[PDB]
Design a protein around this ligand. Structure first.
Ligand SMILES: OC[C@H]1O[C@H](O[C@@H]2[C@@H](O)[C@@H](O)O[C@H](CO)[C@H]2O)[C@H](O)[C@@H](O)[C@@H]1O
Ligand SMILES: OC[C@H]1O[C@H](O[C@@H]2[C@@H](O)[C@@H](O)O[C@H](CO)[C@H]2O)[C@H](O)[C@@H](O)[C@@H]1O
Ligand SMILES: OC[C@H]1O[C@H](O[C@@H]2[C@@H](O)[C@H](O)O[C@H](CO)[C@H]2O)[C@H](O)[C@@H](O)[C@@H]1O
Ligand SMILES: [Ca+2]
Length: 559
């Protein structure tokens, strides 16, 4: 792509191809800011009746997603036009946006939904979904316009466009028990469990309340919808933060959930509940072509292996998108799109079963990461992250590669490579933690590059980073750091075919003193065909001050 191959096209409002009579924001990297939090670090602000931004379709579309920001505690509309003719109204709302913290309490980002004395609003953008009753061809002018009766003001960030097929019917009424106006999901599953000729259930087009955790047991179960734009599982929207969705018991290993959407009612992060799918230790489960929003996570695996997450959309969650932990191995996380996760979009945390091994995170897109990294790998062995697109992180790297234990029982990285192969990282990095007494100090935070290679308290070894383009990172392209006093010697750390374009500070930073009591990196790394282009200060910082770290310039480096 790079990244996921999805049927929708993403178009930035602020593109120079888009006529507007509104206000185009100058980009910055600030959390809590309408530019800093936008895709592309810019939006078009519509602030008077008649103000518009005009998109042009590059593929046919009958359906649209408008990422936008409106005032706190408001709902309303903004208008959509096709070739100058009004065609409908988006339902725009800040119900799920505006999470409050302060610049020194970003650890609270996502947790606190109420405004208050001295609190700043973060996580300002949210989405509106709209289907029109015609497929408009490529080249159609799709205008977003603020008409009389629409909201008082709106920041227009991007538009998704999609040509959605008609809804798919029950594949076989004699094998899939249909949910209906008078037969609930639980009742259909009971009928399925008690009749061995059934393969599962079918959930038709419509809105279907999920006010409970729905348990899958008995045997492997198929749950099939009509398509994610059509079958909508809806948490009770007059409630907040209810733990609903599916929980897959061991008897239902081998199950499949596909072709539907799930619309949670979380308005802030809660740690414990809130994963749309629970399945601790689950095996051979397939989750395919589902679209999930407003949960804490899609899935948090614990010794969960041989599972497949494919073709999914994970948007506007309050923590991680998918995390696989504590022995989770041989999983296929392929061709998924995440935007607006509230913690790491796609993550792998290896812990004791020795390591998480054999996982393949492929063809993944993670953008507008509202906290933490787009992609996070903590230890493990023989795990592949391939064909990635990451962009617009609020507080942390595009990719974190870390051997810090967080107090859990883990061995760090193992004896087979953890591979990042093929990645584009646009405007990644950010500020987090504190930097009291730090070297190379520019603000009150620690400062994170597009890729952070962090040796923690466990072994840091066998890391291969290749075929990566890092464009306009907030601060640095590659950032290497060793936790003191552990000073774990980094071994077999190799970087190949990497372009680092326009980093504001350095192409490569070897962290010398992250904060009081911390020192420089231990071990070394090899660089082949690594280009640093137009760094703000210099190509590499820290080399002379890191006497325990050897930079090996194999060939092809311009620094
Ligand atoms: O393995 C560590 C814990 O993971 C889970 O809880 C996570 C919590 O520690 C924090 O990281 O937030 C995320 C998102 O809300 C939580 O999923 C497990 O629920 C917990 O039992 C583990 O100890
Ligand atoms: O030491 C306890 C904390 O460790 C980790 O965070 C570290 C942070 O405290 C600061 O020192 O910076 C380093 C990175 O340079 C961080 O790794 C954990 O992330 C945090 O949860 C612990 O409280
Ligand atoms: O009050 C529930 C819900 O309403 C709005 O979303 C609509 C959604 O409920 C329905 O399923 O689809 C519509 C068209 O896509 C949505 O506009 C609000 O936008 C949402 O905040 C709210 O929870
Ligand atoms: Ca934008």
């Amino acid at each position: 792509g790079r990244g996921a191959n999805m049927p929708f096209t993403i178009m930035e409002a602020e593109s120079t191809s888009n006529a507007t009579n509104g206000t185009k924001l100058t980009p910055n990297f600030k959390p809590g800011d309408y530019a800093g939090e936008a895709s592309g670090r810019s939006s078009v602000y519509l602030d008077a009746t008649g103000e518009y931004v005009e998109f042009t379709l590059t593929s046919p579309a009958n359906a649209f997603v408008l990422r936008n920001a409106v005032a706190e505690n408001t709902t309303g509309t903004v208008s959509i036009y096709a070739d100058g003719v009004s065609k409908g109204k988006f339902n725009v709302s800040s119900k799920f946006s505006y999470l409050y913290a302060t610049p020194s309490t970003l650890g609270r980002l996502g947790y606190d939904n109420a405004p208050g004395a001295g609190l700043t609003a973060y996580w300002l953008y949210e989405d509106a979904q709209l289907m029109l009753d015609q497929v408009y061809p490529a080249g159609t002018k799709i205008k977003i316009q603020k008409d009389a009766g629409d909201v008082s003001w709106i920041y227009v960030d991007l538009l998704e466009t999609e040509n959605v097929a008609p809804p798919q019917a029950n594949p076989d009424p004699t094998k899939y028990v249909a949910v209906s106006a008078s037969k609930s999901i639980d009742q259909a599953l009971t009928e399925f469990r008690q009749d061995n000729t059934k393969k599962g259930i079918y959930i038709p087009a419509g809105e279907w309340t999920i006010n409970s955790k729905i348990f899958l047991y008995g045997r492997a179960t198929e749950i099939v919808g009509a398509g994610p734009w059509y079958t909508k599982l809806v948490a009770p929207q007059s409630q907040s933060n209810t733990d609903v969705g599916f929980n897959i018991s061991a008897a239902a290993n081998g199950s499949t959930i596909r072709d539907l959407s799930a619309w949670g009612n979380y308005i802030n992060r809660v740690d414990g509940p809130g994963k749309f799918i629970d399945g601790n230790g689950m095996q051979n489960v397939t989750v395919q072509n589902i679209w999930v929003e407003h949960f804490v996570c899609l899935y948090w695996g614990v010794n969960s292996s041989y599972n497949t997450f494919k073709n999914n959309r994970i948007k506007n969650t309050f923590a991680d998108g998918i995390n696989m932990t504590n022995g989770s191995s041989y999983n296929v996380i392929d061709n998924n799109y995440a935007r607006g996760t509230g913690d790491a979009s796609f993550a792998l945390f290896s812990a004791t079963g020795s390591y998480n091994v054999g996982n393949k995170y492929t063809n993944l897109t993670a953008t507008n990461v509202r906290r933490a990294a787009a992609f996070a790998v903590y230890g493990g062995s023989d795990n592949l992250f391939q064909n990635l697109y990451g962009a617009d992180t609020l507080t942390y790297p595009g990719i974190t590669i870390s051997s810090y234990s967080f107090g859990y029982n883990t061995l760090g990285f193992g004896d087979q490579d953890t591979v990042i192969d093929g990645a584009t990282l646009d405007r990644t990095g950010g500020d987090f933690w504190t930097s009291v007494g730090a070297d190379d100090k520019i603000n009150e935070y620690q400062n994170f590059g597009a890729i952070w290679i962090y040796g923690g308290d466990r072994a840091i070894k066998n890391i291969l980073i290749k075929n990566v383009d890092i464009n306009n990172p907030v601060y640095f392209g590659l950032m290497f750091q060793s936790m003191s006093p552990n000073n774990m010697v980094m071994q077999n750390i190799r970087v190949e075919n990497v372009n680092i374009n326009n980093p504001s500070r350095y192409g490569i930073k070897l962290v010398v003193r992250a904060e009081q009591g911390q020192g420089p990196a231990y071990g070394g790394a090899s660089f082949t065909n690594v280009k640093v282009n137009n760094p703000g200060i210099s190509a590499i910082y820290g080399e002379a001050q890191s006497p325990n770290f050897t930079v090996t310039r194999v060939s092809g480096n311009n620094w």
